[PDB]
Assembly symmetry: D2
Homo-oligomer: 215 residues x 4
């Protein structure tokens, strides 16, 4: 009603409201943030950092697919050129991508993209399959974050930065709108060997279920 | 010093400061936003919209590469499934990607990604080549936004949504940190034929240079 | 160089001395062309070859070929063909960091992990060949799970998926037993194939 | 079906009746294998075939093959080979919406636009062939602009890029004249090739 006009109007009064308050208008990035296209609170706000200090990639279900030229080159640029020492993979609750990933309907091109979430499901299927169906999505969102960190750590870019003695740590969090909190999923890597132990330990922890959701 | 701890600390007091102020913690998206990984003001703030109403993809130099599975499937999901009626490609000033695109140094994997900005440069090389070198980056950022809108409009996904009578409009803006304003680059498509005219008209307008920067 | 000028001579002399019905997804290592080992007439084969004959879910290149094959060319048979002594499969199994190609091969390594119990009670020298077969059945399964092939079946189109390995050692193709003409047949034969591969003969056991 | 059971028979009878030095980036339409038209010994060719023999800047599949070829296999020659009657090039030139494959072919269409003045003073029936040649020179140029090939040259590695078209009509390969052994030679021969193609003979003129 028209929605583009409202956006332009909101943009204008925003900028004018900022300039009224100070002189709000260089800064080098310190984290690479890999997040989900359908999350709704932004990283810069959620993490309450200075603007400019997050380098941000957002795709559906916040994935690091082994062969995705988009994300890979972003990671390569962050690490090799911008020399960012932290990559963070942030999932979130009530994630549309994960939901689209689990529902059977073919949605078209995007299903192909989401097939990597489905392999992950079937990888931890024994775990997810003894979980009551209505809770699966919440666990898959967590395990997804664990697997993408592991994926990131296995990329040739990251392994090589570790091999040549460059400082680089990988993190995997889930943002929960329900309390505003970032929650650690336990996979934290500064090396190939921290990657393996941390990931394995993380899946082991996730695999212990609340009695009220089992068979 | 440690930077991860500060982030967690900032996250906590943020969430606690929001809950103090109200009960800040469903909403369907209305725009697909395609933006740049190194821009620093977020879309949700910049456009001052309700959270949840932007579906956001961010990659380096805000590109829609014909064959990028990541962005394409995002666009396909937005249009075919979420039924978003507006895709916005937002570039910005002092864009690192464009700068990396123009500097000669091989930066590695990312140069391959940026080669599409370089083809664009050489496509409008006659224009950019009669511009004083120190201004080129600013024009290339604008022309880039024009070309990516055109790319979006030529994807099979968009053409098909137009063919079956679905409402879909494409926009191409540049965010200017220097005044907070979103500036229209002139390419605005609701159909294949609006795409062509609008794009052509846009390049023609961009090609008229300020006398003080020519030969 | 000489090599190149030799190439042209060889072609020039070869010239003087002288629609498709299948999509063939074979491997870039393989040494015997599909057209030769199948003895098919020139033009029957519409061919894609990549490293380790892969159908990666999100690879635009291969997915494009499949879509073009099925929706436009109206091909009714897609054959995925692995082979023995596959340098890709061997590369994927080494610890060595090879750069960009490693990221491509990580998909194979995920396969290795997926059937790691099976491969773990196998003899070291025989693992590459098992993984080569497992790989074939998995790419067929991957093909059958594309939106493209699923829409084709859904809409009633006659389409059949095949997974074969070509053994250099003797020139014979061997069907790996995952063969789909629908989504339900895909499930059944994929699972059957893995179950068949899981039953091990004494002189493959560690 | 019968077709398939026929395929195996043909292979079984063909069997009874019976490191690589080049990377070959050819097209999935082409009907004559590289190994045949070059008369090379089996295993000399390490092969990638996609639609319209493309080296798209950001295609992981093809870029992976090149990296593996150059950095690991240590191949010193990459040949890009277009051909006449290329169904991909024809597909790219039609107005018809073919689905996913169109997005793949948009890279060719960008090429068509790029040399649109040249193609615009050409006769309609002869355009596909001009675009096929232009396409070859452009993919070679694309290959020479990858970080992979540029690092290889930079670091002193012996690597040569080639761009040929194979004409079905008579079996002869014809060099398109863009041949690079370095970044500076790439520029010079690419530009030379386009300039050569731009000089038009009377019976190609509209
Ligand atoms: Zn999400
Ligand atoms: Zn930027
Ligand atoms: Zn092989
Ligand atoms: Zn062809």
């Amino acid at each position: 009603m028209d929605k583009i006009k409202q956006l332009f109007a909101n943009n204008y009064s925003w900028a004018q409201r900022m300039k009224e308050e100070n002189s709000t208008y260089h800064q080098t990035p310190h984290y690479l943030w890999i997040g989900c296209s359908d999350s709704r609170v932004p990283a810069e706000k959620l993490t309450n950092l200075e603007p400019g200090e997050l380098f941000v990639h957002r795709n559906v279900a916040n994935q690091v697919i082994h062969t995705d030229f988009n994300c890979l080159s972003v990671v390569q640029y962050a690490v090799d050129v911008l020399k960012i020492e932290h990559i963070i993979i942030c999932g979130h609750t009530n994630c549309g991508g994960i939901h689209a990933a689990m529902a059977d309907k073919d949605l078209g091109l995007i299903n192909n993209w989401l097939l990597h979430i489905r392999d992950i499901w079937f990888k931890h299927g024994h775990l997810l399959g003894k979980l009551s169906p209505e809770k699966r999505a919440d666990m898959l969102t967590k395990i997804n974050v664990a697997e993408q960190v592991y994926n990131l750590g296995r990329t040739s870019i990251v392994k090589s930065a570790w091999e040549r003695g460059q400082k680089l740590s990988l993190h995997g969090w889930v943002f929960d709108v329900n309390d505003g909190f970032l929650v650690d999923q336990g996979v934290m890597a500064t090396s190939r060997e921290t990657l393996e132990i941390s990931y394995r330990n993380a899946i082991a922890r996730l695999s212990i279920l609340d009695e009220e959701n089992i068979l």
